[PDB]
Structure 1
């Protein structure tokens, strides 16, 4: 239920939260060809599940 944007201005500053999110690989899609891919995380993403 937690998202990276929840930490901004309440626990950590914005520029530091971006660095933490980008250290993870998040799945997104589908692309124009109907396939899945990975990308670094952003403030809108949820805490990654193991």
Structure 2
């Protein structure tokens, strides 16, 4: 239920939260070929799961 959006201003500064989110690979797609891919996380994404 948690997204990085939740940490900025309430706990941490925005810049640091963006840098935290960048540490993870998050899956996204489909692309033009209908395949899925991975990208660096962004402020709008939910926490990852193991």
Give the TM interval when normalised to the shorter protein: over 0.9
Segments of 4+ moved more than 4 angstroms: none
- Superposed displacement of residue 7, structure 1: 0.3
Cα distance in structure 2, aligned partners of 1:42 and 1:48:
12
Distance in 1, matches of 2:44 and 2:12, equals 15
Q: Distance in 2 between matches of 1:9 and 1:42?
A: 16
Give structure 2 stretches of 5+ with no counterpart: none
TM-score, length of structure 1 as denominator length: 0.98
Pairwise CA distance, 1:25:
0.3
Shift of 1:42: 0.3
- Structure-2-length-normalised TM-score: 0.98
Q: CA RMSD in A?
A: 0.3
